[PDB]
Amino acid sequence: SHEDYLIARELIVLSYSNRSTLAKLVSSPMSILVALVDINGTFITNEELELEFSNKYVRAIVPDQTFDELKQM
Amino acid sequence: PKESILKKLEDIKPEQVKKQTKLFRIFEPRQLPVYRANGEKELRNRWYWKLKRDTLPDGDYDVREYFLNLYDQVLTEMPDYLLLKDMAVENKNSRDAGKVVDSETAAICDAIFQDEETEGVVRRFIAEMRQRVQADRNVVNYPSILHPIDHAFNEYFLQHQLVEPLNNDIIFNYIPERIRNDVNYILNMDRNLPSTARYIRPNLLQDRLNLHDNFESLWDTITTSNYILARSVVPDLKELVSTEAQIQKMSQDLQLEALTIQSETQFLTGINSQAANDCFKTLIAAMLSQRTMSLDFVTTNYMSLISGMWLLTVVPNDMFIRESLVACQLAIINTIIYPAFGMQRMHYRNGDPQTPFQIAEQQIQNFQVANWLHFVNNNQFRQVVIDGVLNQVLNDNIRNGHVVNQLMEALMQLSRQQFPTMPVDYKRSIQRGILLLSNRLGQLVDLTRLLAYNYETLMACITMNMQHVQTLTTEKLQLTSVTSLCMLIGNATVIPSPQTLFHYYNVNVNFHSNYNERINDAVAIITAANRLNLYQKKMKSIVEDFLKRLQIFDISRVPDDQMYRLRDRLRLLPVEIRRLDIFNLILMNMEQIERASDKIAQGVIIAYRDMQLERDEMYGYVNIARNLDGFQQINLEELMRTGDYAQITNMLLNNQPVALVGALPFITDSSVISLVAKLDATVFAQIVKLRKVDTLKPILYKINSDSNDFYLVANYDWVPTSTTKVYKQIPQQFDFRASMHMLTSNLTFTVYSDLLAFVSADTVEPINAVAFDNMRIMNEL
Amino acid sequence: FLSNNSMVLYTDVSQWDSSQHNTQPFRKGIIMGLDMLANMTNDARVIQTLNLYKQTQINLMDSYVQIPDGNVI
Numbered sequence: 001s002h003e004d005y006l007i008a009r010e011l012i013v014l015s016y017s018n019r020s021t022l023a024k025l026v027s028s029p030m031s032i033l034v035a036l037v038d039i040n041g042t043f044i045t046n047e048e049l050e051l052e053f054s055n056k057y058v059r060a061i062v063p064d065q066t067f068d069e070l071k072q073m
Numbered sequence: 074p075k076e077s078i079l080k081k082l083e084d085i086k087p088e089q090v091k092k093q094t095k096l097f098r099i100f101e102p103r104q105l106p107v108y109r110a111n112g113e114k115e116l117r118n119r120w121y122w123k124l125k126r127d128t129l130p131d132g133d134y135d136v137r138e139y140f141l142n143l144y145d146q147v148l149t150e151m152p153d154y155l156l157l158k159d160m161a162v163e164n165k166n167s168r169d170a171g172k173v174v175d176s177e178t179a180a181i182c183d184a185i186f187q188d189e190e191t192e193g194v195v196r197r198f199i200a201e202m203r204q205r206v207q208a209d210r211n212v213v214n215y216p217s218i219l220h221p222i223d224h225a226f227n228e229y230f231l232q233h234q235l236v237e238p239l240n241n242d243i244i245f246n247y248i249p250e251r252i253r254n255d256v257n258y259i260l261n262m263d264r265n266l267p268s269t270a271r272y273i274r275p276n277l278l279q280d281r282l283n284l285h286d287n288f289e290s291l292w293d294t295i296t297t298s299n300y301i302l303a304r305s306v307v308p309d310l311k312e313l314v315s316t317e318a319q320i321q322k323m324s325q326d327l328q329l330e331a332l333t334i335q336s337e338t339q340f341l342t343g344i345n346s347q348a349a350n351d352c353f354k355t356l357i358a359a360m361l362s363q364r365t366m367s368l369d370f371v372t373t374n375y376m377s378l379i380s381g382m383w384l385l386t387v388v389p390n391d392m393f394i395r396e397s398l399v400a401c402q403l404a405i406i407n408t409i410i411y412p413a414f415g416m417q418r419m420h421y422r423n424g425d426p427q428t429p430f431q432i433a434e435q436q437i438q439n440f441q442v443a444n445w446l447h448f449v450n451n452n453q454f455r456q457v458v459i460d461g462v463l464n465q466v467l468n469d470n471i472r473n474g475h476v477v478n479q480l481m482e483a484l485m486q487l488s489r490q491q492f493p494t495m496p497v498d499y500k501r502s503i504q505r506g507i508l509l510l511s512n513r514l515g516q517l518v519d520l521t522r523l524l525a526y527n528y529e530t531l532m533a534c535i536t537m538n539m540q541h542v543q544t545l546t547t548e549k550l551q552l553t554s555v556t557s558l559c560m561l562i563g564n565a566t567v568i569p570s571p572q573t574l575f576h577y578y579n580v581n582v583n584f585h586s587n588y589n590e591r592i593n594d595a596v597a598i599i600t601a602a603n604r605l606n607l608y609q610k611k612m613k614s615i616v617e618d619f620l621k622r623l624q625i626f627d628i629s630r631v632p633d634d635q636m637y638r639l640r641d642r643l644r645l646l647p648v649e650i651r652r653l654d655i656f657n658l659i660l661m662n663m664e665q666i667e668r669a670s671d672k673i674a675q676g677v678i679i680a681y682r683d684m685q686l687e688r689d690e691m692y693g694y695v696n697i698a699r700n701l702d703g704f705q706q707i708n709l710e711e712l713m714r715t716g717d718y719a720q721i722t723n724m725l726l727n728n729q730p731v732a733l734v735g736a737l738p739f740i741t742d743s744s745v746i747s748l749v750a751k752l753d754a755t756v757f758a759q760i761v762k763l764r765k766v767d768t769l770k771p772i773l774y775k776i777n778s779d780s781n782d783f784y785l786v787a788n789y790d791w792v793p794t795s796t797t798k799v800y801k802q803i804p805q806q807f808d809f810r811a812s813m814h815m816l817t818s819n820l821t822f823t824v825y826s827d828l829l830a831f832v833s834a835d836t837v838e839p840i841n842a843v844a845f846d847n848m849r850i851m852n853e854l
Numbered sequence: 855f856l857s858n859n860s861m862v863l864y865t866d867v868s869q870w871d872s873s874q875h876n877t878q879p880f881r882k883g884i885i886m887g888l889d890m891l892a893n894m895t896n897d898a899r900v901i902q903t904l905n906l907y908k909q910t911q912i913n914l915m916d917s918y919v920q921i922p923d924g925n926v927i
Binding site: 057 | 305310
């Protein structure tokens with residue numbers, strides 16, 4: 001896709017010189033971005049490990065210092 | 074997309090509270106030169122009230138259309154609370170430092186003080202114009218300058234505010250009574266609010282449209298909305314018994330073969346933990362929203378029929394649809410009951426008025442099995458009104474779990490019978506299927522008490538009137554998944570945490586107030602566009618908007634005819650008291666805003682006889698008839714509607730006195746030779762030649778001192794005389810000492826919106842949680 | 855366990871291997887736990903295999919590591 005072409009052009013040109021800190025900067029904000037997405041319906045599990053489907057609605061709450069850290073990343 | 078109907082419910086916010094920042098004004102003072110009784114110009118000016126942005130359209134019908142648009146403008150401008158300390162500007166020139174209440178009020182105080190011809194008794198009146206602040210009762214008195222029409226609109230916004238005081242004994246009365254008085258929930262609070270805390274109360278009164286009566290395509294999409302929202306609230310089961318440790322226990326009682334527990338008997342099919350949680354959710358959420366359920370099952374399953382005797386003895390029979398309640402009641406008779414006693418099988422034909430559990434209590438003779446078969450027929454919701462909300466409760470022998478002691482006394486004797494019609498292999502497969510329920514006599518009294526407690530509690534959080542009407546589309550319940558709930562549950566109690574009860578309550582309040590505040594905004598335009606006599610406007614575009622502000626409805630689904638039936642019920646309702654008194658104040662003086670304009674004139678009178686011009690102090694000499702008497706009237710609105718110009722053609726040719734009446738534009742001149750040459754009688758000749766009357770511009774003469782060729786009037790002794798004259802009014806005079814008004818309000822509020830954000834509730838330990846009686850739910854080991 | 859009154863707390867310890875909470879109190883919490891199990895048994899073999907597993911913790915209490923670089927080690 002066109003989204004896959006814009007990522008591959010920056011990871012081919014910059015990877016010719018930056019052999020130390022390229023795989024760290026791109027893979028950094030993934031621990032933060034999984035805390036902003038709302039939950040609308042989830043899979044849960046019982047006490048014994050058996051699957052259940054539960055459709056609660058849980059709103060994502062994020063402080064103002066995470067967005068001041070995601071801007072730094 | 075059942076995850077998008079739920080997102081339309083948590084995205085309904087409460088009503089946007091408005092506070093006004095400037096005063097509502099419709100007139101403004103204006104300086105005009107004055108002329109004496111002779112016509113000569115005085116060396117002074119005088120202040121007259123004039124309209125602000127006078128845009129009056131022509132024709133008598135477009136003036137009625139203008140005041141419906143003004144009534145929409147005032148209704149979107151009235152505040153819910155008003156503090157006069159916000160709108161306050163410093164008075165420039167007073168005895169001490171005072172504050173008038175608006176910036177426009179301070180502009181027309183400074184414009185009279187720095188004037189040159191203003192007498193001193195008005196200039197002294199601005200110096201003693203300040204505020205008075207009472208502190209023990211927090212009120213203030215801020216002076217104003219307003220029109221007496223503006224004084225009526227701005228005093229009604231003050232005396233009628235939507236704010237009530239707030240305490241700690243009134244936050245606890247916001248919580249429902251069945252939850253606050255519950256034993257399992259401990260309710261705490263942290264802060265105590267001051268005496269100046271205020272809050273706005275929603276209007277929770279039941280629906281006046283009766284949308285369950287003959288509106289069956291609008292009720293089906295308004296009870297699917299309450300079915301998905303009630304499904305995201307009822308708690309899900311944790312600590313279920315594991316499936317592999319349950320089928321292996323179940324495969325020793327049936328004596329199955331090795332490796333083929335799923336193919337030898339069809340008893341053990343669809344037993345998961347996914348379908349145990351699915352059935353507990355869809356039985357609680359179908360009763361809280363009155364969606365009719367529907368059963369699916371396979372007749373070759375002897376275990377889906379024994380666990381289908383437990384639904385019909387617990388859930389009332391008026392919820393299942395009749396083409397599937399009968400087919401489930403008949404398959405129990407022809408398999409479990411009638412081959413147990415040895416009688417002939419049922420010859421049941423379609424469309425019979427009696428259900429198979431109602432014929433078979435007459436043809437059966439056993440006493441223990443005709444008591445259970447009698448409780449199934451007479452199991453009904455008992456409609457009771459609690460806290461002004463009609464909600465339908467269960468029987469008192471289903472909250473207790475006493476009904477299971479009637480079920481497992483009936484199928485304990487039905488396992489005892491010897492029946493000769495069936496072989497010895499048909500006896501052994503039913504007698505072993507019916508034993509797996511009798512081994513769960515303890516854990517089905519603890520399951521009937523758990524549905525009846527998670528339905529008693531979540532019923533206390535609803536506010537809308539739940540009515541029991543059969544719906545179009547049925548929400549499906551698989552009878553396989555009731556078997557996976559009866560023989561998979563454990564002795565662990567789940568009760569809904571109070572941060573869910575305070576959120577299921579706060580969605581049902583924000584939807585029941587958004588419903589009611591859209592009825593009152595559509596009754597108030599329907600009743601206003603019939604009192605104002607708008608015979609040409611069609612009301613399809615003010616119910617199409619009403620279905621849109623309700624967030625759950627679609628417009629491309631509803632037809633034209635289901636929109637003109639909804640406005641035949643919107644008329645019969647009375648309009649709200651705040652919307653009526655802001656409309657009776659427009660309708661009382663809708664001829665004082667129309668008559669005080671310069672882009673319009675109220676029709677011409679013609680008499681073909683020289684009459685004197687009326688001398689005013691602001692126009693010099695002007696031909697104005699302030700009253701219309703002694704003349705025949707011809708309504709222009711009824712002349713353009715029918716197009717019959719026979720009466721006005723025979724009267725213009727014959728030179729007879731007429732008085733045309735209607736909202737009419739006009740042009741003005743100032744010459745004197747334009748009066749001697751009689752340019753006023755030559756306008757109406759066009760009506761004879763061309764039929765149209767939309768081109769009519771009468772002449773309004775104005776013989777001042779600054780008019781050219783005025784020395785014709787002052788030298789020769791004559792008063793000016795004209796043939797025709799215009800029905801027009803004269804603008805009022807601006808008296809500064811009689812237009813001041815002291816506007817009174819409070820000093821300080823503090824308005825809160827989310828009242829249940831102050832309490833901090835907590836559940837008791839769930840192993841000790843009591844039912845409606847003294848004992849605890851899920852007590853039997 | 856996810857709802858609107860709960861929160862999840864996942865923490866990323868940076869250097870888990872060489873933190874100060876791992877050198878002395880972790881090896882002396884296992885050694886102290888194998889001395890309450892030398893009084894619970896009566897065989898002569900189960901005391902021996904609980905003494906040898908204790909002996910691998912006292913020797914790793916002060917361990918040197920060997921890293922080669924260039925000529926030196």
